[PDB]
Amino acid sequence: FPTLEVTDVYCEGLPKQLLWQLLGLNDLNHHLRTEVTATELRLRAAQDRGALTTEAASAAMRPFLMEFGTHGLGGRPRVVHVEISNPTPLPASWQLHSFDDPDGVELENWVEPGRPRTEGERMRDLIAEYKLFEMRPRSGELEPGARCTVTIEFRPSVEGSFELPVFLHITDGKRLRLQLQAVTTPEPLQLLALPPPLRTFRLEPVALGERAPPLQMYVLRNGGPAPLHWRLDTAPLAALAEASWGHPVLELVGPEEGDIEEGGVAAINWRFSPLEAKEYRVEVPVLLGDGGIEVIELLGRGFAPPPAPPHGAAAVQLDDDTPAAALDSVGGDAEAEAARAAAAADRDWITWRGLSSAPSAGMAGRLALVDHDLVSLGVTPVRGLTRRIIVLTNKSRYPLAFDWDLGCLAPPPLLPASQLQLLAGRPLQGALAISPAAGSLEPGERLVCRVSLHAGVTPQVFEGEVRCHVRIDDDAVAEAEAAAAAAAAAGAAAVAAELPFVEQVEEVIAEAPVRGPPAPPPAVAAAQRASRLRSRLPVHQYMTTAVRTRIEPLNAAFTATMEARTRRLADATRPPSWPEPQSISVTLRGRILDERQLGALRYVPPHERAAARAAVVAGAAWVPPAMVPF
C-alpha cells in the first residue's frame, strides 16, 4: 500500500523531540506504516457520492491531536514544517481534505455558509475567515523517497480556543484525521509544556539495591504565555516515603520552585530508588503563579537484579545489543523490559523509525544548518570527557554571528577534579562546553564545533537542549560597504587626477536674470523624455484639472492615485534584506553511568550496548586525571 512517513519537523525555537512528541508523530508514523485498513474502504466509499460528513468522519476515524498549545494574543505566528516521504516503492498521491475547506469547486454567486448557530462550527468558520490554520501544499504527490516539505501555520490573531479537523486522505491507502488544537489567550495565563508523554513520565527501571540511582532529568517549558512561576508539592512524595518504611523514593534534587522565562527551559532531577518490583505510581501537583494543577504522574518499576555474587565467585572480565535478549538481560523481570520499552518510546527519539535526525525541513529561509541535529552523546563513565562534533553551514549569502547558549546545561561559574562540589545544585551534573563560544562565519563556510561534556560523580541521564543564535553580521556588512566607499573615493581621486581642478560653482549671489539648469544634449533630452513617458500615469486614471474641478470624487481619486504612486517607491527603496536573527537548537542526550553499572550494563540502552561494552573492555572514554591534591 502506498503510504507516507514524516521524517522530521522544524519549528521556531522548539526542540525537535518536543515537536515530535507534541504532534504525537510516533503514533502517526506507526499507523501510516502498518494497518489492514478495514473501515477505510467504507470511508472512501462514503467520500465518493458525497456521503461523508466532517462530524461523522471525525467520530469514526479516531483523530490524532495536533497540539499547538496556547499563544499570546498578537504573538508571532507559529510555523510547522513537516517532511513527507514515500517509504513504499509505489509513488504516493495524497490530498489533504476537509469538507469545510474548499474541495476544488468554483463558487459563483453562492452565499457563504450561514450562521452556524453551533459554536463548534462557528469556531471552524472564524478559522476559515481569518486564515488561522493554513497548510500550504494542500494536495501533493511524491515519487518513492521524495520529500514534500509541507508547511502548516497558525495565526494567533483572534482570542479563544480553536479546533480544526483535517484529514490526510492518501489516494490509495489509509486516511487519518488530524485535529489542529490551539488556544489564543488575550491574557497571560501560565500553561506549562504538557505533552501526553511528559504528563506520565515513564521513569527508567532502576536496580533495587543501586548504590546511587541515576538522576533523571525532566524539562519544563513555559509555552506561549507570560513567564511561569512553578512550585512542586513534595507532600505526595513524603507520603510515599512514609508508606515505604521511611525510605526516600522518587526524590526531587533541584529546587522545589522556580521561575521559567517565556519559552524557557527548567530542569528537575529525580532519583528513583525502589524497594519492590511493583509499579511505583506517584502523582505530584504543580502550583503555578495563578491557580493551576498541571499534575504529573511518575511511573517506575523495580529492576530485580541477579543476586550479587560473593567476592569469591565473581565473573572475570577482560550479549548482543540488538535482540530482545539484551532487554531481558537488562532486567530479568517480564514487565521491566516493557517499562524500558515504554520509556524508550517516550524519550529516546533514536528508536523511532521515522525520525531522521537531520535538518530535513526548513531548507529555505534558515540562515544556517547544523549538519546533524538531535545529537546523542554516548554513554559515559563517572568522570568522563566525551566529545562530539557538530558542523554549521551558512546558507545565507550574508555573514553570520554564531553564539552558543545552554538552557539548563550551563556550567557553574574542564571542571577541577578535586572541586566537583560546584556541580551541586546543577541539573546536568556535568560541564558542557563548545570550542567556538561565539564566532563569525562567512557565507558558505562550514565550521566544526566540538561539544565536550565533563561529567561529575553522580550518575545521571540527561536529554537537554543547547541553543545556537545566528544573526546577520552588521559589523561585517558595514565593513564591506565602507570598503566600497573607499574604492569609490579612490576612483574619484583618479578622475580628479585625470581632469585637474574641475570647476564647481559654490553658490550664486543675485543672478539678475533667472537662469535655469543647462540644457541637456538633444539625445540626452530624448532619453529623459522616454524615461518620463515610461511609468506614465494610466489613461483611465488621469483626471485633468477641468474634470477634477467639475467632479470632486474624481479629484479625490486622482489624489489617492498620486499618493499610491508615491508610496510604491518607498517599498522598492527600502532594503528588504537583513532577516530576523534565528535561534536553532540541538538536543543532546547522554548517560552518565557508574563503573559498576557500566560493567554490568545495568542502564545502557540496547541501542548502545555494543558501544558500552567496547568502552568497558577497552578504554574508549577519556578520564582527565589532572593532579592529585595530596
Partner 1 sequence: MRDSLKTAVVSLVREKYRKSGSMSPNEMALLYNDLYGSLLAAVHSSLNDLVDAAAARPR
Positions in the binding site for partner 1 (CB under 8 A): 310-313, 317-318, 358, 371-372, 375, 378, 387-391, 446, 448, 614, 618-622, 625, 628
Q: Which residue, chain included where needed, has cell 546543577?
A: 426
CB of 312 to partner 1, least distance (A): 3
Nearer to partner 1, 248 or 619 (CB): 619
Contact present, 39 and 86 (Cβ < 8 Å): no
Distance, CA of 400 to chain centre: 20
**335 Cβ contact partners less than 8 Å away, ≥ 6 residues apart:** 279, 301
CB of 309 to partner 1, least distance (A): 9
CA distance 307 to 288: 45
Nearer to partner 1, 195 or 362 (CB): 362
For 516, half-sphere exposure in the C-beta direction (CA atoms, 13 angstrom radius) is 2
**What pairing do the DSSP bridges indicate for beta strands 228-232 and 257-260?**
antiparallel
Distance, CA of 277 to chain centre: 37
Q: How far is CA 512 from CA 482, 503, 509, 575, in A?
A: 43, 22, 9, 44
Q: How far is CA 530 from CA 81, 460, 526, 536, 562, in A?
A: 48, 76, 6, 10, 20
Any idea of the CA torsion for 131, 135, 137, 142, to the nearest 10 degrees? -160
Amino acid code (one letter) for 42? R
Closest CA to 598 of 420, 494, 455: 455
Nearer to partner 1, 310 or 517 (CB): 310
Nearer to partner 1, 317 or 504 (CB): 317
Closest CA to 240 of 199, 286, 300, 194: 300
Nearer to partner 1, 231 or 372 (CB): 372
CA distance 318 to 616: 9
Chain breaks in the chain (C to N over 2.5 A) after: 318, 413
Determine how many CB atoms are found less than 10 A away from the CB of residue 549.
Answer: 11
**303 Cβ contact partners less than 8 Å away, ≥ 6 residues apart:** 205, 206, 207, 208, 210, 274, 277, 331, 333, 336, 602
